[PDB]
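Interim report, section 4.2 (structural modelling).
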Amino acid sequence: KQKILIVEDSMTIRRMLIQAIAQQTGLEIDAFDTLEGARHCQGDEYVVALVDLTLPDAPSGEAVKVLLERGLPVVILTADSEDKREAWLEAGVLDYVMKDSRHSLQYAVGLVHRLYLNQQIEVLVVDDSRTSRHRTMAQLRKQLLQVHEASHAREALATLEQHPAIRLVLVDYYMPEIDGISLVRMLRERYSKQQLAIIGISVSDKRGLSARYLKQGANDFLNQPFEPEELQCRVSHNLEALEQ
Amino acid sequence: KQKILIVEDSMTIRRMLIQAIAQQTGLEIDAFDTLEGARHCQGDEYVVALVDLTLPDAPSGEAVKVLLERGLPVVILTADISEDKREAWLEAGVLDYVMKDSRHSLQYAVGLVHRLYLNQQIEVLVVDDSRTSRHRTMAQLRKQLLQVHEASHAREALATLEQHPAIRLVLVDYYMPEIDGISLVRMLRERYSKQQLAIIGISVSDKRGLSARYLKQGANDFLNQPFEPEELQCRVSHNLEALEQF
Ligand SMILES: [Mg+2]
Ligand SMILES: [Mg+2]
Ligand SMILES: [Mg+2]
Ligand SMILES: [Mg+2]
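Predicted structure of the assembly:
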């Protein structure tokens, strides 16, 4: 999919977003001031929809559910707490962008650019805890990535053999048989930081596990527990490095 | 300075380091197999020295202190590591260490020396209302060879930025009196884009979701407290590289 949908009645905000996404990404953008204007907009043609909660024909966020049910991923554009972040995210919204300033709005621009590029990117999560593994996988799937799953380094190695397009691996630190630092060592014996990006999952409650990952050639670290925003920052930056 | 010193008696390891650093950086290299070979070497000519602990004329790490005392910053080359060694080396004033147990671990030294060279001409700002954590972070950044400015509150940070427009990276403490970190980030981003001024938002991570708030407000990155020096170094290097390359 190559297009972005914007549903936002503010002329100023809609124009800011169109200009910025056009300049920075070159992606095709369809923008409407009402939910009704977007009635022909389908999941199969759009990467994501940036959706205002205050629409003239949907003034209390009704456009979110409508577009999600048509198969369009949704990012909410919002002016204003822990209860909203939760409720909308539980409803399956990918993310929210604050629209109280031009610079907060700019978050959406990098976001849609990343979502578009992620569609064709394969990543791998290696983690022996089903609970941590599935949480991370769900979060990466809301970044529109193709996500492979491994419960064990042995599985991860086999998955990499089978799927050479995988370009980023997230590696848990303690696992049966072959721990994370050992897996990083194995991978770096074969693959450079440009051929295969590795983010070591660590804890800052420790004798420098992050340092050990980096000294073995991991591109970066991410400390557990992490929030989706943190995961997105760290994954995006590493994917962007591979593209440059 | 644009030269590095390597003192390493392993023919294999020394040659791997020379080849990689020569191919992947702009640094001139002087490399010797004994501490004596480096007798002429002066702190003012070299960015950093990569120093083996097992040298023929310094078989138990003696070259570290000798070279530090000559004013050369020192990164240790080590085949193994423990928590006691890391602590001892950092107390002694070593910048960092490089594992030399494989070819791919040596690669760490290459990215490091390239970064240490570039950092000499880069100005950064630490904003933190506690002198203790502020000075610790400043000391860690000064061991990355950065030019480090300090500010004890948002008001001073702004004044400093006005007075020093070359500052390209700001590290921001959230909890400060009068104007908190996120408020400072909002002010900065009303004037400066992510490419004009990188910001790493520092937070304790709890129910307030501070990292996310920083990110949504335009910070380039986050770093949660407590953090280790290597974590700080990694984040700073990544943000500096993004400014140069993205
Ligand atoms: Mg509206
Ligand atoms: Mg585990
Ligand atoms: Mg030796
Ligand atoms: Mg404070």
